Amino acid sequence: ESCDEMVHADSKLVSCRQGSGNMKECVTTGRALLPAVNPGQEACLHFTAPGSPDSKCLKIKVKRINLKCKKSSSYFVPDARSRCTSVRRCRWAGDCQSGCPPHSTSNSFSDDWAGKMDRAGLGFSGCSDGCGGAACGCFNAAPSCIFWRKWVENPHGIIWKVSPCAAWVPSAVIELTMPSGEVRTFHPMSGIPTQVFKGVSVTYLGSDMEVSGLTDLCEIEELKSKKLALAPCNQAGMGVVGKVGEIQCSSEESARTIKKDGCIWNADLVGIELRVDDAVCYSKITSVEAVANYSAIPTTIGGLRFERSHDSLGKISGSPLDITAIRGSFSVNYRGLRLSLSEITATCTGEVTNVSGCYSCMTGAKVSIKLHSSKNSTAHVRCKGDETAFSVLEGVHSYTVSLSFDHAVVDEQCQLNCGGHESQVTLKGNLIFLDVPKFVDGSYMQTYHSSVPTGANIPSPTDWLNALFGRWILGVIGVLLGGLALFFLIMSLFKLGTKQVFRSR
Amino acid sequence: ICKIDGVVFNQCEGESLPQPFDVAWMDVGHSHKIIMREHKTKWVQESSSKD
């Protein structure tokens, strides 16, 4: 579409050669800066070569600006159950004379327990005491050794993904298109590199926006049911029991199974209480319906309205009312890139056939330009008031772009050049004015608002009283005579009414 | 678990080759065996004449 805010910071900064025989480029490295733009615009990056007349551009597309957070850590918390067993073996030897574990023997597995499995997991093997006599199972008045092993299980296999974060920095999306033809997308962060794609390291900047109710919030998500929620989560491995932060593991593959080598638990996560050779285990792990308030996807805490935006590498979003931030400029860095320049541009001439749009407003004034040339995209439009660059195709086609004007009747003469050849164009049409839209029920903000033109806020005397007149003296005289006649008639009617009201009471 | 040595156990949609799987088992006098994972055992002497 349209384009604005040209830079041209590193023009004529190449050290190329003959160009493989006819013409080529070597490298173009420097540093530039792109200012803030409105959601749904394009920031072109036109290069200038000393030998070649014209070059290609690099458009930057921004769609949404959502409020996300960083990724401090990532882990999976599976669901656990209460499973245990016991045994009632008799001493019958010198093994359970006085005490079963002498000082520290915890591996109470005599090559017979079911702990050596891939579906069990890991736990804590303890011991207990028993009674003696005919009713207790032995023939000696001495306590017996009762061993028990407890472990957690996960029959269903519910998998959760929690990512703690306490920054909540603004971010946005970028649909970058290279001059060669490659078009990809990426999500830059507020000051964090966005996985630079062959030199381009454009980052996003913020304005240090304050928060109201963002102190302990996370982005815990669900994988099977795709259910999201906002609630204070735990921290890294060193945690406390009582809230979220139960038995974790290494990765998602280690979440379905509760085996060792990746799973970490501190202490006091499962209780055991036996009465008579039973070793029954009760559940103490809190479920999802035990945490604090536990906000959900519909969240209206304060001015922020958190929603669920369908996007990759992020599912948490939110958009308050119109903020009109101060600055949202970017910072583009260059490391290495090249563009093929033909330098064989020929005569080309275009003309203007349509003009429309708003006043100096959000969408601007869209003016379609028709060109005709032999090359593909050798064109560059430059004029006073605003500069707009775009790409064309081979042959004769139609292309619609938007420009910024500061006058009601747009009747000027701009200069248009496609590569090396230059010509002249003219515009003639009528434009309108649109103000900032108002708020209505049932509609909520989606991503953000950048800015609204509210500078003048005054009616210009030149544009006003234009269509009412057009001859002007004749129209003024006629309007004055009509107004005088109507005023005299209304005064006569009022006098008659007052006379009727006064008398005949 | 779907099949044990060519013996139908459950109803599955995708079969594969036998794989080593550590699991306890016990016999009760029927045709097929019964595998179990969570079980509590108790050893009693009873002073039987068979011992």
Ligand SMILES: *[C@@H]1O[C@H](CO)[C@@H](O)[C@H](O)[C@H]1NC(C)=O
């Ligand atoms: C949510 O946490 C507790 C739960 O009752 C509540 O007192 C608090 O005000 C809520 N908001 C927070 C912690 O920001």
Ligand SMILES: *[C@@H]1O[C@H](CO)[C@@H](O)[C@H](O)[C@H]1NC(C)=O
């Ligand atoms: C100008 O715009 C009007 C409105 O859509 C359209 O009918 C007309 O065909 C356009 N003219 C050209 C030359 O594109």
Ligand SMILES: *[C@@H]1O[C@H](CO)[C@@H](O)[C@H](O)[C@H]1NC(C)=O
């Ligand atoms: C111009 O663009 C067309 C678009 O399909 C492409 O096929 C062609 O290779 C480009 N270059 C030319 C015609 O030199």
